[PDB]
Design a binder for this molecule. Sequence first.
Ligand code: CLR
Ligand code: CLR
Ligand code: CLR
Ligand code: CA
Ligand code: K
Ligand code: K
Ligand code: K
Ligand code: K
Ligand code: MG
Lengths: 298, 462, 117, 214, 202
Amino acid sequence: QRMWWAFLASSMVTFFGGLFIILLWRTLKYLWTVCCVGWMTSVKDWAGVMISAQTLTGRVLVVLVFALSIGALVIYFIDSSNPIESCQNFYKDFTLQIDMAFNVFFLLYFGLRFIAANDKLWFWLEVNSVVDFFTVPPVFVSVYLNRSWLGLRFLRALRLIQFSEILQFLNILKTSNSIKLVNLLSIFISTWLTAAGFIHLVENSGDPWENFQNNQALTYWECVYLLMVTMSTVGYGDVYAKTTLGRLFMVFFILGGLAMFASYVPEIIELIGNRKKYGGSYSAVSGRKHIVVCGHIT
Amino acid sequence: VFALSIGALVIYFIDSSNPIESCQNFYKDFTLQIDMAFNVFFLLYFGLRFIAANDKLWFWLEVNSVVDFFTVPPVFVSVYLNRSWLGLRFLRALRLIQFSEILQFLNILKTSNSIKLVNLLSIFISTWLTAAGFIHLVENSGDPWENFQNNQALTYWECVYLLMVTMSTVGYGDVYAKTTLGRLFMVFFILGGLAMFASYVPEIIELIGNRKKYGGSYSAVSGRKHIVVCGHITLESVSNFLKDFLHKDRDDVNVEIVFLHNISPNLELEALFKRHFTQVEFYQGSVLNPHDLARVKIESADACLILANKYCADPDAEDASNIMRVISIKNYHPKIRIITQMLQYHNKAHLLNIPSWNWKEGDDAICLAELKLGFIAQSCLAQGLSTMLANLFSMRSFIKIEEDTWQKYYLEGVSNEMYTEYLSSAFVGLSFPTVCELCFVKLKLLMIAIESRILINPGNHL
Amino acid sequence: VNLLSIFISTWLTAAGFIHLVENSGDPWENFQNNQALTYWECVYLLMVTMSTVGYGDVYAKTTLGRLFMVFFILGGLAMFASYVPEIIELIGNRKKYGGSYSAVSGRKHIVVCGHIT
Amino acid sequence: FIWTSGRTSSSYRKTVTALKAGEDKSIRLGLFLIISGVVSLFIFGFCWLSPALQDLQATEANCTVLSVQQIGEVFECTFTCGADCRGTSQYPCVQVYVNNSESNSRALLHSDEHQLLTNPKCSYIPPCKRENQKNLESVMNWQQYWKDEIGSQPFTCYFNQHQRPDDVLLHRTHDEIVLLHCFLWPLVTFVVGVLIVVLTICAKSLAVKAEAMK
Amino acid sequence: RKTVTALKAGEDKSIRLGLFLIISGVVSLFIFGFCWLSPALQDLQATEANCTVLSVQQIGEVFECTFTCGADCRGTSQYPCVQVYVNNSESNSRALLHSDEHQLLTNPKCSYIPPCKRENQKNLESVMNWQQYWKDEIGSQPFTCYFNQHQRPDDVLLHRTHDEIVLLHCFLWPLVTFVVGVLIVVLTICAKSLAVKAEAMK
Ligand SMILES: CC(C)CCC[C@@H](C)[C@H]1CC[C@H]2[C@@H]3CC=C4C[C@@H](O)CC[C@]4(C)[C@H]3CC[C@]12C
Ligand SMILES: CC(C)CCC[C@@H](C)[C@H]1CC[C@H]2[C@@H]3CC=C4C[C@@H](O)CC[C@]4(C)[C@H]3CC[C@]12C
Ligand SMILES: CC(C)CCC[C@@H](C)[C@H]1CC[C@H]2[C@@H]3CC=C4C[C@@H](O)CC[C@]4(C)[C@H]3CC[C@]12C
Ligand SMILES: [Ca+2]
Ligand SMILES: [K+]
Ligand SMILES: [K+]
Ligand SMILES: [K+]
Ligand SMILES: [K+]
Ligand SMILES: [Mg+2]
């Protein structure tokens, strides 16, 4: 028996049940009018300070988030080399225990950002909330079931979008050029890796109307290379999508990914290399005089 | 018309999965009856547009007339013959060109950006689908000089994918045209379709995503006061203001700061607001707009601060702009405390004639020229007094270094500011000199004055 | 007219040269690696190469053919990228609001001019 | 890149508070789910159309075997061994001919449509298990179990006089469950999208009534 | 001069169309002419002849035909090879008979191919049927045949592979496009110039 749907159901149920609970609470709050500084604000302020880097504990938490995002991405990269669905012992799988701990920390960081949030519904629809709903619940389900599906785990790469924000929190990024460069690099890499993971999932699991018989055995790095070739418009043709869903995804990505590549790669290359050629200072020579000339130089 | 165009396109999409020519019973084919009715409606809509036309010959040569001549008669022939050919039925996709026009008729599309976006999307999609249908027809029916033997069995969606790959210039080579007519069509499409793709896809992506990041409005918090700041907002102006407002030498104030400005903040201002994430909020709007003033909740703000551009090219223009801002804020809410910077003194006199301008309630016009010339005059009574006064306002921490230099002593002196607070009943009934010599080093506090209200250095008789 | 003439003549001449070079093989290979390519096939290959589509169904295989392909990729893509947009801009410069009003018997009409916005 | 990296000489009432922005984002989401559900329904509909008609056009029948025999010829199956390891092994060909309910004439039995399409010249294929001896043993085992089935029990069979004109199948190759899920979950997406819009408008309009009440 | 009303714009669009049809017809004539050139010369260069069979025999070797079964289903079946040799009107020497140019090109080593009908037995039966009908045709009636000493140097055909009707339609309808384009220009100029005379008459 296969269990792929249990992981996916846990994410869908989490995202939409939370959204419906929030909307029902709103509805019923106003409906009570038909029948008819606080500690809440103090904990909201404390959570907002923790979320920012205004304290030592907040800085430690932000650095931990930065490290654990890369850790989870590396864990997904390790798992991407295995079969699509498998049975594996939680008590004897160090990577599953490490993932379990990482997702505990992300659940806690999610809880802190929820408490700190001003508009809950606005928070529930912030995309790094969506990234947590589509990546945290399936880890819990896997650790409970003693089984894993390599399903939507490529969405972990979207965690790189917050890197510039948490670098600005840590008082590291100050200049506009550096901020823009980090933003562009993060968006480019996360988009590339996420799209590669999705096309990897879709190619390795065939079309349902073809009874999953036309699947193509493509590795994650092969899909990454194919996406790079497609984005740059080189189009070698050695590697390409063959399933109907894969090609349907390829068509929608060709509209967005080429505009991203054509826009971001020149701008990144302009932002880098902005070095001053004439820097440094003169070194005096003993026994030889020197003359400084300034004013109208042409 | 809008619905039936999509209906006919969907009918063509269904038929594109069948053989190229076939016999099918009109009395037992629901899709052929539905197509029959759809084409009756298009014949009627054609007749109405013909009657409404001014120049008939101009109408006969309008391309949606041509699209009807190439799509309506063959449906009639098919319904008469009890047979169908998947011939020029892909021209149905050209019906999407009129979508923007009939949306403008229905008073739905009004803005230029939305009209342009709809036009570009319609032209792109209709061109793509029509070209895909034509290459599908040409590939599935081979070359006449090769006796139709070199035909390639390509599905319509396969041809759509091939056209997308060709337009974007990716050119995988997994799917390509093989017939001579198919390649001849490919060569002419490569000239036009790449120029369309290269032009339209960036422009569509620019038209979408034009969202305002700083929208919304401030949400007041019970038990906590907030302050609205407007006027000259820039990275250095906000950075200097926040250093003095949020300094650790004040007591534990939790006044929120809300900025209102009509320019989107640059990346360095957004980073400055992120470094103050729990104490500063920014909202993009105009102080002259009552909607924006309601957005920043200025009716419940504790005060409104209006910073001025001290280095402006036209002091008169800057004063006029600040006067207009004050007028707008007072007009929205007469009972709002307003603190503003005024470059000149005659413009300050102009401003204080406002009916809602109440200096007793706390309206302060900080006149820069007046205060600076007064400070210069006090330096003429005692040299160094301008420095003495200026350092009493700026919030400064103690700074200490091991070097024995004049700077150490100077910084130790600079560490003090002027404050104001109520004093103990244990000092009521004594003389002002007596409480001064008491406070001086026992409490470590120096008094310049007390609240016949404001009295500068009282005598021994008070 | 200048752009169209230069584009077409360059395209056809380059296609003929690559057709000659592909159909007569390499002298160091003793003319044994020749590829039987028709002139129209070479024209299609040149169009595919110029537009940067690069299907790969048809391509040069001889050493001289590839050496010619490398030098043409430098010039022909810059020509295509420059000329095709400029030609497409030059065409289609039609005035949408031309023509003249046609009076209707029994109905009056009013002409409005000046500051129209 | 594409067109010289897009260069070419530079060719080309408000009483509601902050909650308004979260609610407008909730409308957006609910609308996007409505569009997604409808679009995916059409996409899956075009993909399932030919398989579903090729399945529907095949009628159920009652069958009985006329004969079981070998044609003496042999064919390659592929056998597999981890990573990518494969080789080929022979199997002997059986043919089986069967009584038919629509044409009442000879047709050749094919266990399923994948067997028909992988070797239309032959009636059965063994799962390739290394050596030729095990393939022949497994064909002889299936052959003996089919040869004595003479009118024992008219087993049901699937036929299509328009595209399997003298070929017969023992199974449907179209899983009803997989099709059901392909049309159910896009419908669920659409219903969820409607409920999100409805609750967002219900909350938005009740906020105005609860404001005017004060 | 601009006495004509709005009708001027419809008539200038009608001139455009008529000119575009003239250009289309001429361009398509050249395009079809280049595509038909090699097939038409390869057909013209093959002369009509009178033939008689020298012998009918099998070479003992067998070949694959492909047999088909809906969607994409195909497999292969053997057929036995006949060869047939024939008297010739241009070279007066041995040549091998090939029923048509597609048979010559699909298997130039062999004289006939059966339409693949599933099993080998039906292919062999259909070859034996054709073989027996050809073996007794000895001088019975000098059947006409097609030959080309320059590109079918010892090969002979029973049929022309070039349909005259398909070529006729490929050159007729571009000519019709051109004639219609001329008549549209002519009637548009005739209407435009008579409108000026009917205006000056008032
Ligand atoms: C508290 C909320 C967020 C939990 C999220 C819902 C998830 C966890 C729910 C939804 C459907 C549930 C699954 C439904 C069916 C099975 C199969 C059974 O053999 C073990 C339990 C298991 C595997 C359930 C595990 C929990 C589950 C996956
Ligand atoms: C975590 C998921 C599953 C449940 C979400 C909890 C929901 C039902 C509850 C818990 C606390 C509630 C929030 C408490 C405070 C506010 C601030 C007010 O100005 C708007 C409503 C809002 C935002 C409430 C909305 C509903 C709410 C978010
Ligand atoms: C539908 C096809 C078959 C026939 C079209 C009808 C023909 C015969 C007739 C009917 C109505 C006529 C039009 C009626 C009115 C005008 C306006 C006038 O100032 C110039 C002639 C013009 C433009 C006529 C042209 C010819 C015309 C279009
Ligand atoms: Ca101090
Ligand atoms: K390219
Ligand atoms: K390419
Ligand atoms: K390519
Ligand atoms: K290629
Ligand atoms: Mg706040």
